[PDB]
Symmetry: C3
Subunit: 130 residues, 3 copies
Amino acid sequence: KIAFYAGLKRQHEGYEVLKFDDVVTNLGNHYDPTTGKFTCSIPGIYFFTYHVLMRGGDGTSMWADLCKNNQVRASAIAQDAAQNYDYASNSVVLHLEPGDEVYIKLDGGKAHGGNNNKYSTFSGFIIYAD
Amino acid sequence: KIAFYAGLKRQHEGYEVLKFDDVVTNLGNHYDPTTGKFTCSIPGIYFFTYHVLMRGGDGTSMWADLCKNNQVRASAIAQDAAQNYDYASNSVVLHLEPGDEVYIKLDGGKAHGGNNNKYSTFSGFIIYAD
Amino acid sequence: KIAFYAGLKRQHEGYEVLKFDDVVTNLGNHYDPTTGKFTCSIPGIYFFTYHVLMRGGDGTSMWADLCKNNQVRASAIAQDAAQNYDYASNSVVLHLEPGDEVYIKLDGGKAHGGNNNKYSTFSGFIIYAD
């Protein structure tokens, strides 16, 4: 059984892997909140989704991408000229091999820190094992 | 088999549980459109997602949260200074016990009523049974 | 095994079926990038999700709907008065019969063409077979 769901506790900005450290579900423990990465243990087909809230009142654009190892597999942008809150979100279905790492990377801009409120999230589960 | 998908027929505002009463799928009947709550029957791991459209042309901010019993498990905001349409959306993976209730709550602001168009939605399914 | 995930390579506008032609996953091959349609082969319960990015700097509103055959099953809008990027996204759980087609239709406005960046996406998988 492999499934996880975590939220973002602190605010972040720039270009870095987002560490979702407010962990709600983590079956099998293959999501690591100290690195922000999900690591595949079983070859198969996996679903992931993310929702990253842009910081309000400071900046107009924010990008957040889902990566597999060193390769972008989904991109998203949040943008508002009045510096309002908005989301960068996307969802994927991916085949993974053991050792593959999946994570969300900020690609510019400012993300909201939601302490325990879980405004910004990352989740996933296996659909099929090879 | 446990899965459901429902849309919002009428407009709502303030602080209340959203009743998605345009029911498309409801296997096992454990989503109740008269209360807006999904009730767990089987201990296990469940996926949920929601997409709530803010009312356009009247107001600038709207909050919508997913709750488990009396506890928020995901939060979302829609915000636009020009009072444009925008979404409060999020997704979760949760462990539930029999009797647990999962639902979407408005936490301020105005939600769009989509009659039969299904602009605003709530869905879920079991991933694992304990 | 039935699952797929594809992104939008080119920009599109108006009223047309969106052809997600940047195919990442397509188990069983029942998603067709030349038509943009997923075709059911097995009666059962299916999950779908989509995220369509509105074109920035040209236009204020865009609509994107998920359809089953000739019937809308989910709707979404992106709107920004300053012509900023924003998303039309939704998710569904549907019962399908063999031959049923599921696809995303633009219902007005301009969608972003993300070449290989996968800003705009469509994915799905079977949850239950009848």
